[PDB]
Design a protein around this ligand. Structure first.
Ligand code: HEM
Ligand SMILES: CCCCC[C@@H]1O[C@@H]1C/C=C\CCCCCCCC(=O)O
Length: 465
């Protein structure tokens, strides 16, 4: 391929980044922010400032990788460092996480990265026999509550009930603990939300005018001290609930304190936060796919479950072709976490589809995943949600291009990479979500809107079987 100069510029100091930040949050939004510049530069690889800049990030300058050929460089640990850039060009204060640099911020070359990731592998593996009955029991309550709300109001706010459900499910599946039986009561969603806000506010817009938002959440960090006691409530819950997992932490040579802050982060930020983005988006997309798709999903899931003697099992789910594919299409069409960063360890040649580009050691690389996963030179009808995309031998090959987990879907998280530790779990619970919906309902209608993180979704009808 021809070597090309990386297009784009960073504009003037201070003023360049601010204008790019207004574009990103207010005047264009992220998708059009990235696409308008692809069109301008005639390149899917270019230089751009990324938020937050201001006083929170020291350097907003990145090289954006916005196609599915160049983006995978971000998985390659021989090529990029993955230290302290989970949230990009800035890092939330370790005051927010008990003074620790949590697993998600550690490079694979740090020994504690191996210990902590192995701990989460154990967390997940040791919960395998609770996932099914706990998901089915807690999500059954969710849908009871949603049917109730629909009959009262004529619509049912999904996100307003499903946040509690997700956390209840995680506590019971991961720790055999019902939050209702603890001091947390039903408080966890609110505590986690505030704490996540304190972590992620430099990257978020909450719909307020820019005159308020910019000074309040985009220039300076929100003080960690103001969430410290909310965090302590969550910490004490993990300390008292994580008994069996803490013995294994002890065996792995991890302090009880470090294990607990890490278990909290993994459950509350990685898992519950990812679920908080994913499930309402799934409802939105599946809802938009229409009633014929719902009926086909319903017929598949029910038949397969009946063929399995009414028992839902891991192996039964492998039969549910459209179900597996729909889940994959949700993850491709709309990756829940869109921002992946990596610092070039050495000088690199990054190939895109029509040119190659030279980056120097130390440059921050950034990918906006939905432009890699909706890349029209990799996927046909790339901006269409196609439920059956991954069905059959030929569709399954395309999975290596589904990147939600910070790696190809065909690859496994290891202690050596930075691929999502809960990869298999996420795909599992997302499938169980679809299974629970369509073993109850032949179809549904939604009303949708925007959320600071993902989507705001209402059911306006739920057609029971
Ligand atoms: C639907 C929910 C989830 C979503 C959307 C999601 C997405 C992601 C993404 C994109 C990354 C890469 C971060 C980066 O380096 O830029 C990541 C990393 C990570 N995730 Fe997940 N994830 C989810 C659930 C989970 C679960 C269930 C676990 C269970 C323990 C988990 C644990 C982790 C950990 C420990 C890392 C850092 C990996 C490492 O340092 O090697 N996440 N996740
Ligand atoms: C809300 C919690 C996000 C899900 C957590 C899961 O561990 C991955 C998060 C990876 C990087 C976090 C970046 C924070 C921005 C999240 C929303 C905006 C976006 O999608 O980029």
């Amino acid at each position: 391929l021809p070597i090309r100069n990386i297009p784009g510029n960073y504009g003037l100091p201070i003023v360049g980044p601010i204008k790019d930040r207004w574009d990103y949050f207010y005047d264009q939004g992220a998708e059009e922010f990235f696409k308008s510049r692809i069109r301008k530069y005639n390149s899917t690889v270019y230089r751009v400032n990324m938020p937050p800049g201001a006083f929170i990030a020291e350097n907003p300058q990145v090289v954006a990788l916005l196609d599915g050929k160049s983006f995978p460089v971000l998985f390659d640990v021989d090529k990029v460092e993955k230290k302290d850039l989970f949230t990009g060009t800035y890092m939330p204060s370790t005051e927010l996480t008990g003074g620790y640099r949590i697993l998600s911020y550690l490079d694979p070359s740090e020994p504690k990265h191996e210990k902590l990731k192995n701990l989460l592998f154990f967390l997940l593996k040791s919960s395998r026999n609770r996932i099914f009955p706990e998901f089915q029991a807690t999500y059954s309550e969710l849908f009871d509550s949603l049917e109730k709300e629909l009959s009262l109001k004529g619509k049912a706010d999904f996100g307003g009930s499903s946040d509690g459900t997700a956390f209840n499910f995680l506590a019971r599946a991961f720790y055999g603990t019902n939050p209702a039986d603890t001091k947390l009561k039903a408080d966890a969603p609110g505590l986690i939300t505030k704490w996540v806000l304190f972590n992620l506010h430099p990257l978020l817009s909450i719909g307020l005018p820019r005159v308020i938002e910019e000074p309040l959440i985009h220039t300076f960090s929100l003080p960690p001290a103001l969430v410290k006691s909310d965090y302590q409530r969550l910490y004490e819950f993990f300390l008292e609930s994580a008994g069996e997992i803490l013995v294994e932490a002890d065996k792995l040579g991890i302090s009880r304190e470090e294990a607990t802050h890490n278990l909290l982060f993994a459950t509350c930020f990685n898992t519950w936060g990812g679920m908080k983005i994913l499930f309402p988006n799934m409802v939105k997309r599946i809802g938009r796919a229409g009633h014929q798709v719902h009926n086909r999903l319903a017929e598949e899931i029910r038949s397969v479950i009946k063929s399995n003697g009414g028992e839902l099992t891991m192996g039964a789910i492998e039969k549910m072709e459209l179900t597996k594919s729909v889940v994959y299409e949700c993850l491709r069409f709309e990756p829940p976490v869109t921002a992946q960063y990596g610092r070039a360890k050495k000088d690199l040649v990054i190939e895109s589809h029509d040119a190659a580009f030279k980056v120097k050691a130390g440059e921050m690389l950034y990918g906006y995943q939905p432009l890699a996963t909706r890349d029209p030179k990799i996927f046909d009808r790339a901006d269409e949600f196609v439920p059956e995309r991954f069905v059959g031998e030929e569709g399954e090959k395309l999975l290596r291009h589904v990147l939600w987990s910070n790696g190809p879907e065909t690859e496994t998280p290891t202690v050596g990479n930075k691929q999502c530790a809960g990869k298999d779990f996420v795909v599992l619970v997302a499938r169980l979500f679809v299974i629970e919906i369509f073993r109850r309902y032949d179809s549904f209608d939604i009303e949708v809107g925007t959320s600071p993180l993902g989507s705001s979704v209402n059911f306006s009808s739920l057609r029971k079987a």
